Amino acid sequence: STGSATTTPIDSLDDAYITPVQIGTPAQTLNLDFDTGSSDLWVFSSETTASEVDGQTIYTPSKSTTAKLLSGATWSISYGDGSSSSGDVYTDTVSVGGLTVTGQAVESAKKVSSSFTEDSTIDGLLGLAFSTLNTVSPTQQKTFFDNAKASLDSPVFTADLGYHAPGTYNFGFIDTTAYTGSITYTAVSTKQGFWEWTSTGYAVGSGTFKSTSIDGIADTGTTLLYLPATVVSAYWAQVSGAKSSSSVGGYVFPCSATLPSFTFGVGSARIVIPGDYIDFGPISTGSSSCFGGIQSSAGIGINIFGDVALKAAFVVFNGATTPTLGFASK
């Protein structure tokens, strides 16, 4: 089997992307944030504290003939941005782009933090990291991909995120028309539960590529590119007027700037992020100061190849017995 679904930016900055997902019988379609940095599929629901719902579409398990309550099970997650959610657990039929998993754990939120409430466009998350990170207790549950894997034509999914435009998540096949040149594959460590890999270096603009190992995670659920302070400083030093602002919370630059590209290495291959992808717009409405899309990972504890990086590539998440990641230009 295969599946193919379009993913759509939630706003004009590509802050996140949402993908329609069918849950239950009859189908209830919710727009979920596919997150390769976490491993829980959780949704706003009829059980979510009413004052914490503000415009989201909710899952109502009592209206699904296929919903089953997982007796006594709970879940609770905290994300890197400090947001969180928790609740109880159902299993139900879940379909993405024509691919169906029966008995998928659907984690129903009883509580969500303010950042989730305040974002009316995201109805929940669909985790695509390794199932070892799943937070269900007492017994951990499998991700949608883990459950679908054995049925797929090939044990892979691909992320093809758009710049200020829709893109595609495919399951079970590689669309050879979706990229230019070849896909370069690189090793993955699953030791921390992430799609963790080692980039072979970077370049700033037209500068010569610097060969250096940069361990990080491929994370569709993170907006920006977070890299070591050395790398990030080298990038912003090429932007006139750029500076790190502790009050804003990162590097800012004059909105009138022409930003250089940023290149990262995948083996001997190279992915070039255009300068425009690094512009995240005015720091506040009407400001002439803009927020940068490449920021320091210092104090996160891990480097993150988030959407800024991933949307410059066609990315293969290969879930074979020994997982790997593939990157192609597009």
UniProtKB/Swiss-Prot annotation:
Ranges of residues in domain Peptidase A1 = 17-328
Top enzyme category = hydrolase
Report the record's disulfide bonds. C255-C290
Q: Does the keyword Metal-binding apply?
A: no
Q: Which GO MF terms does the UniProt record name? A: aspartic-type endopeptidase activity
- The EC designation for this entry is 3.4.23.22
Name the residues annotated as catalytic in the UniProt entry. Answer: D35, S199
> Alphabetically, which GO biological process terms does the record hold?
proteolysis
Q: Which UniProt keywords apply?
A: Aspartyl protease, Disulfide bond, Hydrolase, Protease, Signal, Zymogen
Which reaction(s) does its UniProt entry say it catalyses?
A: Hydrolysis of proteins with specificity similar to that of pepsin A, prefers hydrophobic residues at P1 and P1', but does not cleave 14-Ala-|-Leu-15 in the B chain of insulin or Z-Glu-Tyr. Clots milk
Q: Of which family is this protein a member?
A: Belongs to the peptidase A1 family.
- Please identify the protein, giving its name as recorded: Endothiapepsin
Species? Cryphonectria parasitica
Full-protein interval shown: 90 to 419 of 419
